[PDB]
Design an enzyme around this catalytic site. Sequence first.
Site, PDB file in Angstrom:
ATOM      1  N   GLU A   1      24.794  29.754   1.253  1.00  0.00           N
ATOM      2  CA  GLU A   1      24.137  29.328   2.484  1.00  0.00           C
ATOM      3  C   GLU A   1      22.624  29.559   2.428  1.00  0.00           C
ATOM      4  O   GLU A   1      21.851  28.708   2.886  1.00  0.00           O
ATOM      5  CB  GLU A   1      24.744  30.041   3.691  1.00  0.00           C
ATOM      6  CG  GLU A   1      24.292  29.456   5.009  1.00  0.00           C
ATOM      7  CD  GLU A   1      23.071  30.121   5.589  1.00  0.00           C
ATOM      8  OE1 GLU A   1      22.724  31.251   5.136  1.00  0.00           O
ATOM      9  OE2 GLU A   1      22.479  29.522   6.490  1.00  0.00           O
TER      10      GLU A   1
ATOM     11  N   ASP B   1      27.965  33.349  12.647  1.00  0.00           N
ATOM     12  CA  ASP B   1      26.753  33.621  11.903  1.00  0.00           C
ATOM     13  C   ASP B   1      25.862  34.557  12.688  1.00  0.00           C
ATOM     14  O   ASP B   1      25.711  34.362  13.886  1.00  0.00           O
ATOM     15  CB  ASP B   1      26.013  32.331  11.580  1.00  0.00           C
ATOM     16  CG  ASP B   1      25.057  32.578  10.430  1.00  0.00           C
ATOM     17  OD1 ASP B   1      25.008  33.737   9.938  1.00  0.00           O
ATOM     18  OD2 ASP B   1      24.360  31.640  10.063  1.00  0.00           O
TER      19      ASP B   1
END
Length: 320
Positions: free
Chosen positions: A160, A207
């Site tokens: 990511e 997240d």
Amino acid sequence: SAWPEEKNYHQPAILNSSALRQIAEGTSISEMWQNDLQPLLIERYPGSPGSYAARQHIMQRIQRLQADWVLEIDTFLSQTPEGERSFSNIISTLNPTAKRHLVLACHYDSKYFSHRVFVGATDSAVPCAMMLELARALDKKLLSLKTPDLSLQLIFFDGEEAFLHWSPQDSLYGSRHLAAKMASTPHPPGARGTSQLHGMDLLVLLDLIGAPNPTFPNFFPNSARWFERLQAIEHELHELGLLKDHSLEGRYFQNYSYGGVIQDDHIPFLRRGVPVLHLIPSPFPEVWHTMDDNEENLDESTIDNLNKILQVFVLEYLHL
């Protein structure tokens, strides 16, 4: 046929008070901390020893469960600012051949920083632990799926984080790969038209979770009715006295809009039409991208509360 539209009319099966109590009792924040979180608090940027250990940890914790999880490692190569790297998405699926899955995701890599080390506690070790805690806590109920055409999947994205500074080409390595792959893969096998992307009912991306007093805004019209479910669940759990150190004035899920565009693992899914519920707070944690994004700065009660909420949400979605 019309099965890819079933997501649009899917309703929760709402839990009673005595069920909510049972779910609140069935999650253990200390076991998550000891068994799920602590082993993940290591440098785990792509190709580092830590990346391999995080990956083995996540898989071992999953395989040890009764429910019939099928793991797949999605490994590929990409150029990066540092030179070519290998990346491995972990996909953990119940009932792979079911047309539809609810999808919970996070990333398990940590952003690289030059030397104290960055272990990205909220970013995203805690999201990982929460997913593994959900799998553990709901195991008996999820086992019942081994027998509509809807189940659960977990994705732990690699890559990511940008290696240098964020760009389209330096970020989201694993999610951009897996989305493109799913977009081209028939689902169910032998079907015409429909992909694995069709099969994703809703992508619930965790997240930057674990700082005190998070505020998650209502990012997307097309998931707003599920966002409303999170607000409702938080509200009932509070009233039932099942959350800790929680005020209705300081609630996590608040029905306001958000002004910009956040770049994250959902981006390659959202641009191809997948519905996203993005459980990232605004503002980001105070320690964001800081050596202080660490265990010490985490709020255990907040995380425990979010576990309860997310677990109710998931049971309610899957009708368990």
